[PDB]
Design a protein around this motif. Structure first.
Motif, mmCIF file in Angstrom:
data_model
loop_
_atom_site.group_PDB
_atom_site.id
_atom_site.type_symbol
_atom_site.label_atom_id
_atom_site.label_comp_id
_atom_site.label_asym_id
_atom_site.label_seq_id
_atom_site.Cartn_x
_atom_site.Cartn_y
_atom_site.Cartn_z
ATOM 1 N N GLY A 216 0.791 -1.234 0.000
ATOM 2 C CA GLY A 216 0.000 0.000 0.000
ATOM 3 C C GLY A 216 0.819 1.279 0.000
ATOM 4 N N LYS A 217 2.133 1.132 -0.125
ATOM 5 C CA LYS A 217 3.053 2.257 -0.041
ATOM 6 C C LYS A 217 3.236 2.924 -1.394
ATOM 7 C CE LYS A 217 4.631 1.827 4.367
ATOM 8 N NZ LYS A 217 3.434 1.316 5.099
ATOM 9 N N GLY A 218 3.300 4.248 -1.383
ATOM 10 C CA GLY A 218 3.509 5.006 -2.615
ATOM 11 C C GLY A 218 2.272 4.996 -3.491
ATOM 12 N N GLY A 220 0.248 7.331 -4.368
ATOM 13 C CA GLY A 220 -0.842 8.252 -4.069
ATOM 14 C C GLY A 220 -1.899 7.780 -3.086
ATOM 15 N N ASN A 223 -4.003 4.192 -3.630
ATOM 16 C CA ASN A 223 -3.362 2.874 -3.485
ATOM 17 C C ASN A 223 -3.967 2.168 -2.278
ATOM 18 O OD1 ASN A 223 -1.687 0.600 -3.197
ATOM 19 N ND2 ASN A 223 0.250 1.728 -3.247
HETATM 20 MG MG LIG Z 1 -0.014 5.387 -0.814
#
Ligand SMILES: [Mg+2]
Ligand SMILES: Nc1ncnc2c1ncn2[C@@H]1O[C@H](COP(=O)(O)OP(=O)(O)O)[C@@H](O)[C@H]1O
Ligand SMILES: [Mg+2]
Ligand SMILES: [Zn+2]
Length: 251
Positions: A216-218, A220, A223
Motif C-alpha cells: 500500500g506504499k507510494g 498516491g 493505493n
Molecule cells: Mg499510498
C-alpha cells in the motif's frame, strides 16, 4: 491575460525530472469533477525554459540529484505548444495533499505509460496508450492556505466520450475486454507486485489510472493495497484478450 507556471516532466528511462516553464490561461470554473479532483479547460500561451526561475535552496523536492540539468528533449514542447487546449486538475478542498503527492501522482501516470508500452509489445488486438501528465506550480498565485504554494497537474484534452471501465475498488463498469485484460496483464507480469486499475478515458486513450501494491506504499491516496488487489480479483472475468496473452486463469 494568463499566468506563469513551473512545468515538471518525469522521464522514467533516465529516472529524472525535467524542469520547464509555461504560460497558461485557465477557465474560472471546472467542466468536470471526480472523487478527489476538479478539471478545468485551459489554453497554452507557450512553453519555455526554466532559466528565469532559479531553484536555489537545499528541503528541495524533487531533490537536486533527481533533476536533469538538460531539458532540450521533452514532450511538453510539442504536446503543450502555444494555442493547445488542455486540462488542468486541482485537488478538492486539500488537507491530505503534500508537495510530494503531486509529483507521486505524475510519476504514477508515467509508470502506467511504461506498462501500456509493455502490453503493446505483446501485439494485443487493441493497443492502448496513457496520456502524459505534468506537475505545474502556479507561481503567480498567492499561497492562500496554510501558506503552501499552489500546485496542480495538467494533461492533454481527451476529445470524445469519456468512459470509466473499472474503478480502483473492484467495479467493472463496461463490458469491453481490453481494459480488464490490461489490468490482469499488469498483475501477472509484475509478479503480483502491482496492478493498474481505474482504466478510464476515450476508447483506448486513458488517463488518471491508479496502481495498488501489496504493501500500500507510494502511488498516491488511491493505493488501497492488498485490499484493492483482492477486490479486482473478486470481479475479474477473463476474456478473449486475456486468453490471447495466455494469462493465468487463477489470479
Ligand atoms: Mg499510498
Ligand atoms: N484528460 C481529460 N480530458 C477530458 N476530460 C477529462 C480528462 N481527465 C478527466 N476528465 C473528466 O474529468 C473528470 C474527473 O477527472 P479525474 O478526477 O482525473 O478522474 P476520475 O473520473 O477518476 O475522478 C473525469 O470523470 C472526466 O469526466
Ligand atoms: Mg489516480
Ligand atoms: Zn483475465
Amino acid at each position: 491575460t494568463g499566468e506563469m507556471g513551473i512545468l515538471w516532466e518525469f522521464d522514467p528511462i533516465i529516472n529524472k525530472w525535467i524542469r520547464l516553464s509555461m504560460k497558461l490561461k485557465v477557465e474560472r470554473k471546472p467542466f468536470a469533477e471526480g472523487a478527489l479532483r476538479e478539471a478545468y479547460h485551459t489554453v497554452s500561451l507557450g512553453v519555455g525554459t526554466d532559466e528565469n526561475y532559479p531553484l536555489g535552496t537545499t528541503k528541495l523536492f524533487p531533490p537536486i540529484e533527481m533533476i536533469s540539468p538538460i531539458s532540450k528533449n521533452n514532450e511538453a514542447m510539442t504536446q503543450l505548444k502555444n494555442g493547445t487546449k488542455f486540462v488542468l486538475k486541482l485537488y478538492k478542498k486539500e488537507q491530505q495533499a503534500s508537495r510530494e503527492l503531486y509529483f507521486e501522482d505524475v510519476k504514477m501516470q508515467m509508470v502506467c505509460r511504461d506498462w501500456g508500452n509493455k502490453f503493446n509489445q505483446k501485439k494485443p488486438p487493441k493497443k492502448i496508450e496513457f496520456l502524459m501528465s505534468w506537475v505545474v506550480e502556479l507561481i503567480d498565485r498567492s499561497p492562500s492556505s496554510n501558506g503552501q504554494p499552489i500546485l496542480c497537474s495538467i494533461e492533454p484534452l481527451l476529445v470524445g466520450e469519456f468512459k470509466k471501465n473499472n474503478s480502483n475498488y473492484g467495479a467493472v463498469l463496461t463490458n469491453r475486454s481490453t481494459p480488464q485484460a490490461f489490468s490482469h496483464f499488469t498483475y501477472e507480469l509484475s509478479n503480483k507486485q502491482m496492478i493498474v486499475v481505474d482504466i478510464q478515458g476515450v476508447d483506448d486513450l486513458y488517463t488518471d489510472p491508479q496502481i495498488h501494491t501489496p504493501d500500500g506504499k507510494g502511488f498516491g491516496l488511491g493505493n488501497l493495497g492488498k485490499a484493492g488487489i483482492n477486490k479486482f480479483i473478486t470481479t475479474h472475468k477473463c476474456n478473449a484478450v486475456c486468453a490471447l496473452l495466455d494469462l493465468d486463469v487463477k489470479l
